[PDB]
Amino acid sequence: SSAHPETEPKWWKEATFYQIYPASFKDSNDDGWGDMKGIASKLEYIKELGADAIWISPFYDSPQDDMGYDIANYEKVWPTYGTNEDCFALIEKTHKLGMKFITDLVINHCSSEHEWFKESRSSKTNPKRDWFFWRPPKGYDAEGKPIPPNNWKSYFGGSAWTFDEKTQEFYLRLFCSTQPDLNWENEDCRKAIYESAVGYWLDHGVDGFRIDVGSLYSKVVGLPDAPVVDKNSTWQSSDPYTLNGPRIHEFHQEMNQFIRNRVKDGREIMTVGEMQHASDETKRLYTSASRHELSELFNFSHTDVGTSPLFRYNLVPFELKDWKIALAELFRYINGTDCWSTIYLENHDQPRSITRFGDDSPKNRVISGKLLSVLLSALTGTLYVYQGQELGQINFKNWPVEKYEDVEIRNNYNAIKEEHGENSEEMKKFLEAIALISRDHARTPMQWSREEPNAGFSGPSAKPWFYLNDSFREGINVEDEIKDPNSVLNFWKEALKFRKAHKDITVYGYDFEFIDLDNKKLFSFTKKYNNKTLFAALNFSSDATDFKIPNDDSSFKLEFGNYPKKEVDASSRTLKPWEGRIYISE
């Protein structure tokens, strides 16, 4: 383990994080929106699950055009969630329970309702004009409409620019129309960002930050037209010119130094960057401890499987090997380095992992939910669990498009309507995809009980901000699962206990090697920690599946699995349907 600097323990390496989506976690006042008092009331539940830390998605003052990722004031809690004092009390309560607290740092862009943007947009001459990207129209089209400065596509569909009537220029917004991108080329802007979004929260005791699209701050000069890679789209991915840009490491080093110099009590701050996509070299540049940038990052390859690289909402076939390799991208690069990794399958931007990677049928949803827990329990990195994942939540079914709340759905729908027609093959493919892939599968209210109609998220007379998934009626809820010894929830409790008990090799294990990589059913691997060897055999299928342990001998003992403990034959070399096993040799 001495030739593996990544094994150096840190609180944030071995902490299990639980991610809370504040709108959808717990309503305490029957207005249909989750809130901070709701979260506070459920911290004991989170601790009992086995979490060491929480990450709360944005709770700052926001018009909610992108459900909190459009921030109008970094230093004020959205009144619907509570007051600043409510938040400070929540941070303190979290700490007094022995858990860490990280907040969502969203500084690629802010809301157009932020005072910075209200000033910037007011004239061409004000001190904050170049805190954002303002450009004249490229020209005007045959119908007299202004043409945007370039061909860049928004992450939510259509053009990445919005025209301002008053000042007669476009502003850049990679996300929705009211999320203008901040201009990190402006040093005054960077300093103000650090003071407001970072310093304020350090002063109020956060243990770290999850950094929203942290790889987008550096734009290539000139904002040039992007390559025409999609021949059936007016607008093109800006990635070559916005993703991991030439100043991105400079900016992250600067922000890291700001944090180091602003902390007052010498505490260890974690940063996890939502970096999206990166070569292994880029990942190392971000997460090597010696680089003083990020602690770790999220990489999207494993959550991208089964979607077109050109458009997330066009489905494509994939096989198990694709997912194995994409998952391994999270962690293999850290082997023998001072880097660190993340491990997760769910977040507020993803559909449910059982639906995607298990089998959500009534027959298989429990056992395959447990299989995913076995897998995650054994992988190296900081583990994240998303609200409802521990219940074995599944995608919702048979919703019409108009029921989806997400701006990502609304904007993409409208772009397709405009470009291809509402009644088109392009629309049909989109509608097929949203049923599997939409972020909204993560955002339906948390299911605390079987109570009609709101599943204990709110009182029975309240109207939730977004519709409940019908799965609460099928026993997918906290109250029913606590009482069922065979539940996914009770299994996740066991999985986290197992992971912690064997943390040297589960959290800090190294020399990861795939066994039978090509296998369409068997996901198998070994890891090392000094004299210890961990071996996993995981059957991602409804069929029985054979496996072999490399260098098999009597030392390999069955330490965890999802089939009944007293009914498993550890010496058998065939897995039952959806069976997973973790063996450890000393």
- The residue ranges that bind Ca ion (CB under 5 A) are 27, 29, 31, 33, 35
Instruction: Give the list of residues 6+ apart from residue 507 with CB closer than 8 angstroms, or none.
Output: 13, 14, 380, 381, 383, 499
Integer angstrom CA distances of residue 438 from 142, 275, 314: 36, 20, 11
Closest approach, Cβ 38 to Ca ion, in A, equals 6
Backbone angles phi, psi at 379, to 5 degrees: -95, 145
In whole angstroms, the minimum distance from the beta carbon of 35 to Ca ion comes to: 4
Judged by beta carbon, residue 27 or residue 296, the one nearer Ca ion is: 27
User: 27 or 349: whose CB is closer to Ca ion?
Assistant: 27
Is the CB of 58 or the CB of 157 nearer to Ca ion? 58
CB of 57 to Ca ion, least distance (A): 15
What residues are annotated to the active site? 212, 274
Question: How many other C-beta atoms lie within 10 A of the C-beta of residue 480?
Answer: 18
Q: What residue type is 169 in one-letter code?
A: E
Are 90 and 46 within 8 A, CB to CB?
A: no
**β-sheet bridge partners, residue 153:** 159
- 35 vs 359, beta carbon nearer Ca ion: 35
Q: Describe the chain by its helix, strand, coil percentages, rounded to 5.
A: 35, 20, 50
Q: Which is nearer to Ca ion, 76 or 321 (CB)?
A: 76
DSSP bridge partners of 208: 102, 270
Instruction: CB nearer to Ca ion: give 35 or 440.
Output: 35
CB of 90 to Ca ion, least distance (A): 14
CA angle, 114 as apex, 261 and 137 as ends, to 5°? 110
**Exposed/middle/buried for residue 322 (C-beta within 10 Å: 0-12, 13-18, 19+):** middle
What separation in angstroms does the CA of 541 have from each of 33, 402, 501, 550? Answer: 38, 34, 28, 22
Burial class (CB in 10 A: 0-12, 13-18, 19+), 102: buried
Q: Please give the structure tokens belonging to residue 82.
A: 């509570």
CA distance linking residue 413 with residue 402, whole number of Å: 10
Task: In angstroms, give the least distance from the CB of 22 to Ca ion.
Answer: 10
The nearest distance, CB 29 to Ca ion, in angstroms, is 4
Q: Are 138 and 127 in contact (CB under 8 A)?
A: no
Question: Toward Ca ion, which CB reaches closer, 29 or 288?
Answer: 29
Instruction: State the minimum distance, in angstroms, from the CB of residue 36 to Ca ion.
Output: 9
